[PDB]
């Protein structure tokens with residue numbers, strides 16, 4: 001049996017997408033070693049049905065630990081943002097443990113994420129082929145690589161303009177970029193990406209030219225789950241009108257500022273929509289409460305229309321509920337893919353990293369709308385309220401709703417043939433590499 005070790009970056013969205021890919025590979029008679037920190041493995045274990053217990057094996061990776069950065073913080077999930085550089089550095093320091101794991105397990109292939117250039121380096125030293133799997137979409141990667149080759153030319157095939165807020169948003173950025181570049185360039189023969197041609201084909205073709213490598217889509221990769229946490233939420237949603245409610249979430253690794261929450265809250269209130277909003281506090285803060293993060297009296301004024309959930313909610317179950325008419329989202333790529341799969345239009349409030357590019361692609365495909373920031377880069381309560389009202393409450397953006405339903409139909413028609421290309425490229429790569437090693 002051909003064995004694959006998978007090494008996601010230490011974020012919940014990365015773990016989730018890698019796990020869905022692991023499931024699809026396991027059904028093609030690959031044996032998977034799924035490698036991450038213990039805190040990440042514990043968070044993802046509930047998402048693996050017992051049907052996979054024999055073919056997907058978890059392997060713990062150990063990072064350097066200290067009382068001030070202990071192992072339960074070795075994840076981006078709820079991590080204080082100021083600890084993000086320490087987490088990247090600690091992950092790079094796991095390379096020797098990673099080498100010993102690869103020596104002991106001797107997998108035939110490594111599939112690695114784009115935040116760990118040390119991983120393909122270790123694999124190559126051990127004569128283990130390594131392929132890069134990207135859990136973002138293609139658009140942001142092609143936008144990042146284009147200036148390296150065409151520094152004086154506008155990006156082709158798109159009218160998207162990045163807001164000055166993010167253009168402004170030095171060596172931390174450069175080294176993360178150069179690490180990302182290495183991960184792409186080091187990949188053996190192909191790169192894998194969680195996207196699909198109907199959405200991003202022209203950008204995959206362009207990225208393939210920029211890299212001189214085949215770009216292989218393996219998307220849509222979307223996780224779909226008796227549940228007590230959803231029960232209370234389900235009971236509330238069951239009393240609402242169809243397509244009347246928005247889910248509001250900024251993902252697993254972002255905490256909007258007090259001012260950002262103010263604009264979102266006032267946008268929700270003015271729109272008169274029903275909403276479920278996930279509000280979170282960073283690890284180590286178990287004093288803070290919902291009431292302090294929100295404007296004074298906001299939940300009192302919202303009354304029956306509003307529900308705030310602390311910490312975490314069953315996002316996929318909520319989006320699939322017939323009451324949900326929209327998704328106010330930071331536009332993390334897994335959230336975008338889920339929203340498209342479930343046919344829910346996106347109201348984009350991107351915050352950082354790849355999100356503004358994802359929101360621009362959402363707008364371009366017409367399956368959602370982006371709440372634009374004002375000249376100074378602030379979220380605008382008026383823009384949030386107007387888009388919720390148009391898309392969900394009054395439903396005057398029927399173009400958006402129809403395109404989102406159309407996209408869902410397309411995505412639901414896809415089957416296991418979406419993995420045919422990846423499996424053939426893996427087979428070829430391993431057969432070429434077997435001759436080399438000989």
Ligand SMILES: O=c1ccn([C@@H]2O[C@H](COP(=O)(O)OP(=O)(O)O)[C@@H](O)[C@H]2O)c(=O)[nH]1
Pocket residue numbers: 011012013014016249250251252253254278311312313314315316331332333334335336338
């Ligand atoms: O309260 C929450 C917040 C997030 N998610 C899931 O966490 C993942 C978030 O991934 P995404 O790429 O959207 O954003 P990130 O967390 O990486 O910024 C998605 O699968 C969401 O469905 C969830 O289930 N409940």
